[PDB]
Structures are given as structure tokens and as C-alpha cells.
Design a protein around this ligand. Structure first.
Ligand SMILES: CCN(CC)CCNC(=O)c1c(C)[nH]c(/C=C2\C(=O)Nc3ccc(F)cc32)c1C
Ligand SMILES: [Cl-]
Ligand SMILES: [Cl-]
Length: 287
């Protein structure tokens, strides 16, 4: 909090609400010095209560990241009972949004996975673990650039704490060692990435129609999910590689960036604008 700032409205204009809202609400905004659009997450501190140390964690993590693959951080500003967390505006919405009109093709899947993997590689090299990897936290610019967002439950490894054990994340995407609250590390993100790959290919993660508390016992109990259906062998093998019950048998993000599925199928991020346009057309017609 030592770089906390004040009087945000002298540097930024707050515009309309655009969504939720991990810990608050997100507003569109303007940087009055550049006229670039920004996203402003606003947190009511007097009702914050329980989530206060998660809010603190998010700011800390964001302030420590400097990557094209992680939502850029402008700063946090105190205004009365409100905290403004000002971040990169990403006008293409989330990968989850972009799934709504229908299936992706494997070029789009590989392209999105590649950029997620670059983000994971960065975070894991900084001894950070995202711990909530899913399509909803993968955000895109209007021209298709891809970044990881929402660091409210991110973990930080240090020389004296080489593993985490906190029960956090979203049950469908959680690694088994996380559910068991075993000592875990960045390999937990690699499991979540595997589930996210299935989500991008099928539209939804495994068990998506069950109550989340059910999957809390299903995920450790069952064999790992596999990608079923008519998908290329490398995509299926990519998923299988990620979804190993034994975390040390999962590849690193660096290694997955050299996986045949990624190399054969990933193309320019700018082609993802086709997906953004598909969503805009679809949303405009939606009754
Ligand atoms: C047409 C509207 N759709 C539903 C009705 C899409 C709704 N969603 C939208 O409009 C939307 C857009 C275009 N950006 C954001 C949020 C963020 C953004 O830009 N950078 C961030 C960095 C961090 C973070 F935590 C959130 C954001 C939303 C909710
Ligand atoms: Cl944008
Ligand atoms: Cl098993």
C-alpha cells in the first residue's frame, strides 16, 4: 500500500459501469493525460470486511507485474470510503464472452492458449501462481491481444515458503492437490489450464452441470478428465499432459509453449478480432 495514491478524479474520468467485479464493480474510464480508455474497479472499503486482505493481495500482485500478458496496472487511489484500482481497458471482453455465440476452431483455441501460456510463464517465473485460471479471467483487447486478469486469490512463493496450501479458485477448474489443500505450487495453474483448454474446446469445463460441492469430491476421486469428441490428436494430448493427478508430471508453461498443438495451430493474435466481431454481431441480435 506504500504506493497508494489520492484524488483519482484529477487524473481520471469515471464513466459507465461495465461489469463485475471481483470485490466491487468495474467502470469504464478515461486517462485524462492520454485520453486512453481505462478500466476502473471500485471497492467500497466500509463493506469490504472479509475480502480486505484479498483486495490487498490483488493490488500487491498487480503492482509487481510488468507483462504484456497481465492486465497493466495504473495504480490504486483512495477516495473517501472507496478504493479505485485502475487498470488496462480491454475492449474485447473475456474468452468466456467470446465462447457464447458458438464453438471456437482449433486455430483460435491454440492462439488463446499460447497467450495464456506466456502469461503463466511470466507469473511462474516471478514465483506467482494465479490460482483462478479459467476463460472468464482471460481478457482480450478489441484487436485480439490476450491478458490474464483478476489476481484476488493469487499466491506468492518465497525463499521461506516454497509451496502454498490455501483452498482458493473455482471448483470446476481447481487442481486436486488444491482441493485436498496439499502443499502445491505453479503446477496447480497447469491443471487449471488443462481444464481451460477443455472449456475453450467444448464451451464448458468438465462437470459443469453438477453442483460445485459435488466436484469437490469428484475431482480427487475420478481419473483426470480427457477431451472427448472430434478434436485433433495434439489438442487431446495437450489436455492430457496438463491433467495429470501428479503435479510433478505436469509440464511447465515454458514446455507447453513448445507443444505440437500450439506450434501447429497458433496464429497471429490479430486474427482473434474475428471472434470479437462474431460476439458483437451475436450480442446485438440477442433478444
Ligand atoms: C456488450 C457487453 N457484454 C455483456 C453485456 C460484455 C460485458 N463486459 C464488458 O463490457 C467489459 C469490458 C469491455 N471490459 C471489462 C473489464 C475489464 C477491462 O476492460 N480491463 C480489465 C482489467 C481487470 C479487470 F478485473 C477487469 C477489466 C468488462 C467487464
Ligand atoms: Cl481494447
Ligand atoms: Cl486418478
Amino acid at each position: 500500500m506504500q504506493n497508494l495514491k489520492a484524488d483519482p478524479e484529477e487524473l481520471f474520468t469515471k464513466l459507465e459501469k461495465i461489469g463485475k467485479g471481483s470485490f466491487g464493480e468495474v467502470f469504464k474510464g478515461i486517462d485524462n493525460r492520454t485520453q486512453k480508455v481505462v478500466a476502473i474497479k471500485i471497492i467500497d472499503l466500509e463493506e469490504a470486511e472479509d475480502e480486505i486482505e484479498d483486495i490487498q493481495q490483488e493490488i500487491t500482485v498487480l503492482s509487481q507485474c510488468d507483462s504484456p500478458y497481465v492486465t497493466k496496472y495504473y495504480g490504486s487511489y483512495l477516495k473517501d470510503t472507496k478504493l479505485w484500482i485502475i487498470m488496462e481497458y480491454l475492449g474485447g471482453g473475456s474468452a468466456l464472452d467470446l465462447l457464447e455465440p458458438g464453438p471456437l476452431d482449433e486455430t483460435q483455441i491454440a492462439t488463446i492458449l499460447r497467450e495464456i501460456l506466456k502469461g503463466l510463464d511470466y507469473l511462474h517465473s516471478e514465483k506467482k501462481i494465479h490460482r483462478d485460471i479459467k476463460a472468464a479471467n482471460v481478457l482480450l483487447s478489441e484487436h485480439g491481444e490476450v491478458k490474464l486478469a483478476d489476481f484476488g486469490v493469487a499466491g506468492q512463493l518465497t525463499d521461506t515458503q516454497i509451496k502454498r496450501n490455501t483452498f482458493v479458485g473455482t471448483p470446476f477448474w481447481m487442481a486436486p492437490e488444491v482441493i485436498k489443500q496439499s502443499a502445491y505450487d505453479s503446477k496447480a495453474d497447469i491443471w487449471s489450464l488443462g481444464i481451460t483448454a477443455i472449456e475453450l474446446a467444448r464451451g464448458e469445463p468438465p462437470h459443469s452441470e453438477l453442483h460445485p460441492m459435488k466436484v469437490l469430491f469428484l475431482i480427487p476421486k475420478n481419473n483426470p478428465p480427457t477431451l472427448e469428441g472430434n478434436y485433433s490428436k495434439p489438442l487431446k494430448e495437450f489436455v492430457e499432459a496438463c491433467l495429470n493427478k501428479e503435479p510433478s508430471f505436469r509440464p511447465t508453461a515454458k514446455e507447453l509453449l513448445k507443444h505440437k498443438f500450439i506450434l501447429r495451430n497458433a496464429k497471429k493474435t490479430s486474427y482473434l478480432t474475428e471472434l470479437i466481431d462474431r460476439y458483437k454481431r451475436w450480442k446485438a441480435e440477442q433478444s
